[PDB]
Design a protein around this ligand. Structure first.
Ligand SMILES: Nc1ncnc2c1ncn2[C@@H]1O[C@H](COP(=O)(O)OP(=O)(O)OP(O)(O)=S)[C@@H](O)[C@H]1O
Ligand SMILES: Nc1ncnc2c1ncn2[C@@H]1O[C@H](COP(=O)(O)OP(=O)(O)O)[C@@H](O)[C@H]1O
Lengths: 168, 350, 192, 329, 192
């Protein structure tokens, strides 16, 4: 049983933080300088979930728990190259049947990472950036003939330039 | 097989003044046919599906775009609605209702259901209403979106085929939903104010701030082009739901001049319908530019002017149509702007 | 005290004060003496309506014995600057400044009640100090008197010389006389 | 073939106070017949389907228009209903049965559906009729079969369909759109109890968008662009319906006493008052029996015991109930 | 302090102040001295009721010792302008202006309590300045007195000569005498 919980960090923050009194005699504790989301969920326990709304009986039936870190700018770059079902390889096969090759330079993937985080949508929000760039290309590609290669540079993502096409 | 240039050329016959939306849709549909046609059993497998999100003003022609596309397109098409839906077994409607509605168009053929396309209207109506101390469980709000997540991504749901003659059948079919395309679009309200604050300038109520003088003089559409997923978050949509719809369409607006084009250029224009209705009788129908201008103002005054053209045109020719069979030796009919107002009678030529 | 009312809408019931409900219908109230605070509040109301709809007529009901001139002139420029036609109505009384804002409304959309009364006079002032300072403040208030007569003639259509003679002292004008004087357009006796 | 002018005269014998309605149907019927009989290869291709939906006030005579048109038209007629709620093919079968298994003549036959509002979006049979109006073939067992198996395919694209039903609450939906705000100040006008909120002058401004608010699907409405408004009734109509028709209640009760050797009379001074009473009940002609029977009740109760009453006259006061009807000896 | 009440509705329970609850039933309260603020507030209430229902009678309870004349005349013209019949009731006391608004109600829908008391006198004023200005303000207040007597005769039915003699000085009228004078229609002693 697993699903993305919303606001759990706020509850975990309250419990993980020791807490302190606001008066003079009560000591003050300096903590939680950075959010440390990935490192914060690791400190989860069943008692925090009770305050969130889950019944202890239901959690007792689920002894084990798994905390998943949030992907970062660098994580997305590896996801586009190493996995076999990556979106980059999908389009590579899409053009392979068309007798055209596809390439993704490192400069273009770095820009996609910054735009992906800007939309706060994760990996699922990556197709929006890709299809937006190749839109013009995909519109005149089938009609186009004698084209053997397509290169996507960093400028294409910003929109200043168009993808370079090689005729062969 | 259908080429984006060829499909766009066909759509131009049925759509006027909308170009950006055509390019966006053409690529998706072409990929969809290719995805389903090509087996894809190569090194790269399980190709992703780019779902389309349509945005535009009310009465802009969204329903016609899906239906007119469905007319020339072989695969079936359905027109569902999001407002009727209610999550977790509530009074309004179960999500599964959408699937059973599709099968009727597909003649209860599972293979044909994956081929067809689905359309949803008024998607903005289910925007996450955010009132903290009222319910905290908005059935009409956020709750509906959570149920559609698994539906759009892909899953198999039991569906009684044909409803069954009687209890005797008591069986259900498994219908995949991964390969099925989903087109969710609705006219968002108040979205223009959200993007103006963050993108262009310090507009608003004050003196130096740009006033909304161009309520009808200029089209707000250009602003929608700069829309992004982050702006929809303020509207109420969940980021997870937006991730399911990467593609976006603008559909800026319809113009008064475009209405004139809609009556002359399209194949299904009203002018061509009545023209052929009278051609068989040995009569000709002539429309003047002045007459069209009057129609535009009357339609603009009423709500959903695009859908009101039939009423204005039918009333104008209702009286003339009654007397045309009775009349003889009449070869032409002339309509004037004054007639549209109702103060004049159309001229008759013998 | 201000009574609270309930406005029924499709979304649900909403509670509004009597003054805010009428504001929703493009109606503003000008009550009591005209000061810097009361005038600055009306300006924000007019601007708020401009953004909502710049093509709908505004109705301004005035019942006040007048007040500061500088506070009132800010409202006059606002009515003329904005595109909507600011309809003005006189209820009870309209003093010197109340009369200037009354006639400044859009032509053809100015009304006065059958028993209302308007009063017009010259600007009032005063100063205490050296003779050099009295001459400065005297020249300044004289320009205002000339300026107020020029604008009054512009909307009323009368001549500048006639307004100067009629504003030398207090002059009361009944509701019918205001029509004959060009100050208003008609009287709203009964609803038709 | 028949023109709007000539067909109007025949319908006028059975239709009264619905002049504008005739114009819509006359043009629609003539246009529809020509569409079937034209080459269909003209430049004006993909002609929009011309279907008419009747606006039904309670007891407004919609059934009369269909019967009069059906009787006048030589083509077969069928009286279908949406009560079936899934099984639509049976409706098609009914037309063929009258037609005597002739698909050609059946093609030229128009059917009228009643109580279409009963299948509104209040909970999906409407989706099934979409494939029917747009044209499709439905299996129909010819003659039912002697024992245990074939079916006949009868096209439906060219057949006309008249879908109409009495809608409830439709006036309230139109009121919200047409009110276009209410003013509070002096210059703004305030509406009275009822100036434009009457049934008359409210349906003429109806549009397809308003029907969507009621529950109808746009696909269903798209197939029926044309719409005709139907007046509810009028004082003149009620006066004529009690006198001009042969099966009027006045003539029926008059015949009830003829066998008893007693005559009955109804003056015009009594019928005008009856009209004011019928409109107050908002039930149309169907609610007329309650008024007539109530007055007669006291009369018919003690009529057998009464003797030497050769004729009975009904005065205007009788409808009021204050004065008993006068007896003629 | 103002007590809060609960009104039960189909949608749910709503909390209302005592004055707002009665406002929903077409009831307005006229309390204390008549000034520009109190008068301008009642006018907005009448307009609000006109839009909600223009065919239902309005009830106006008056308990006030009078006040400014110009503030009260705005209310009189409003009552005559609107279509609904403005029922007036005198509770406790009705001074010069309170009596003018009382009798100005719709004919046949004016009532006075058995122990209420009405008082009428001539307009009060004053001025300080040059003799030329005193003559102007004297003619103005004279027109009001003539105008106020004309309307009193119109609604009361008495002659203008009788109203002039009776309004020269303060004149108290008991509840029964008010009926004989044509000022009111009846007395609401008990509920029937
Ligand atoms: N490009 C177009 N060409 C011709 N007619 C058009 C066009 N766009 C809109 N219309 C007209 O607009 C009407 C309504 O079209 P719709 O697609 O329903 O608009 P809409 O914005 O989808 O309305 P909603 O969103 O369903 S409320 C059509 O029946 C046409 O008459
Ligand atoms: N113009 C008319 N002329 C003659 N009879 C009429 C007319 N209008 C209504 N009727 C009567 O009304 C009846 C039909 O009622 P109808 O409108 O079908 O009820 P509903 O609206 O419930 O379907 C018929 O019996 C018919 O005699």
């Amino acid at each position: 049983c697993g699903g993305a919980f919303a606001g759990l960090d706020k509850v975990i923050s309250h419990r993980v933080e020791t807490g302190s009194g606001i008066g003079f005699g009560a000591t003050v504790k300096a903590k939680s300088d950075k959010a440390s989301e990935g490192e914060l969920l690791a400190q989860v326990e069943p008692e925090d979930l009770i305050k969130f709304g889950l019944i202890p009986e239901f959690i007792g039936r689920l002894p084990v728990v798994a905390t998943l870190n949030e992907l970062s700018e660098e994580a997305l770059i590896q996801i586009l190259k190493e996995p076999k079902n990556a979106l980059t390889k999908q389009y590579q096969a899409l053009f392979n049947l068309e007798g055209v090759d596809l390439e993704f330079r490192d400069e273009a993937l770095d820009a996609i990472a910054k735009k992906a985080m800007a939309r706060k949508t994760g990996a699922r929000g990556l197709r929006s950036i890709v299809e937006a760039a190749l839109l013009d290309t995909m519109y005149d590609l089938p009609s186009m003939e004698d084209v053997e290669k397509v290169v996507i540079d960093e400028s294409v993502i910003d929109g200043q330039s168009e993808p370079l096409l090689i005729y062969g | 097989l259908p080429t984006p240039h060829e499909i766009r050329n066909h759509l131009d016959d049925y759509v006027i003044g909308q170009e950006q939306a055509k390019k966006v849709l053409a690529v998706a549909v072409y990929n969809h046919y290719k995805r389903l046609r090509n087996g894809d059993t190569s090194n790269g497998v399980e190709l992703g599906k780019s779902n389309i999100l349509l945005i535009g003003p009310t009465g802009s022609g969204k329903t016609l775009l899906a239906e007119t596309l469905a007319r020339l397109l072989d695969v079936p098409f359905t027109m569902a609605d999001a407002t009727t839906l209610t999550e977790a077994g509530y009074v309004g409607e179960d999500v599964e209702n959408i699937i059973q509605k599709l099968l009727q168009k597909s003649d209860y053929d599972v293979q044909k259901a994956q081929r067809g396309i689905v359309y949803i209207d008024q998607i903005d109506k289910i925007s996450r209403k955010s009132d903290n101390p009222s319910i905290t469980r908005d059935v009409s709000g956020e709750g509906v979106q959570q149920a559609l997540l698994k539906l759009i991504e892909g899953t198999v749901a039991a569906v009684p085929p044909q409803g069954g003659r009687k209890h005797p059948q008591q069986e259900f079919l498994q219908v995949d939903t991964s390969k099925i395309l989903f087109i969710c679009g609705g006219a968002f309200a108040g979205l223009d104010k959200v993007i103006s604050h963050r993108v262009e300038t310090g507009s608003g109520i004050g003196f130096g701030a740009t006033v909304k003088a161009k309520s009808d003089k200029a089209s707000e559409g250009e602003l929608l082009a700069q829309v992004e997923p982050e702006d929809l978050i303020k509207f109420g949509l969940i980021p997870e739901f937006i991730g399911r719809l990467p593609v976006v369409a603008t559909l800026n607006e319809l113009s008064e001049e475009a209405l004139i084009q809609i009556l002359k250029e399209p194949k299904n224009a009203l002018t061509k319908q009545y023209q052929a209705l009278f051609n068989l009788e040995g009569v000709d129908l002539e429309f003047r530019d002045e007459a069209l201008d009057a129609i535009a103002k009357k339609a603009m005054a009423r709500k959903t002017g695009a859908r009101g053209l039939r009423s204005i045109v039918e009333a104008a020719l209702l009286d003339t149509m009654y007397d045309l069979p009775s009349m003889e030796d009449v070869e032409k009919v002339v309509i004037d702007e004054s007639v549209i107002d109702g103060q004049s009678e159309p001229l008759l030529i013998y | 005290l201000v009574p609270m009312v309930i406005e029924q809408t499709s979304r649900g019931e909403r509670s509004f004060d009597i003054y805010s409900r009428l504001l929703k219908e493009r109606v503003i109230f000008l009550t009591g003496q005209v000061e810097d605070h009361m005038a600055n509040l009306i300006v924000a109301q007019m601007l708020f309506l401009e953004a909502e709809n710049p093509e709908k007529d505004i109705y301004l009901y005035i019942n006040s014995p007048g007040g500061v001139i500088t506070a009132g002139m800010s409202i006059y420029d606002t009515m003329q600057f904005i595109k909507p036609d600011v309809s003005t109505i006189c209820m009870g009384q309209a003093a010197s400044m109340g009369a200037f804002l009354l006639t400044a409304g859009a032509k053809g959309k100015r009304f006065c009640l059958p028993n209302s009364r308007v009063m017009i006079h010259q600007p009032l002032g005063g100063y205490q100090g050296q003779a050099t300072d009295i001459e400065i403040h005297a020249r300044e208030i004289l320009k205002v008197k000339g300026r107020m007569n020029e604008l009054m003639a512009l909307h009323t259509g009368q001549s500048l010389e006639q307004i100067e003679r009629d504003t030398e002292r207090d002059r009361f004008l009944s509701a019918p006389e205001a029509v004959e004087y060009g100050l208003v357009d008609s009287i709203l006796t009964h609803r038709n």
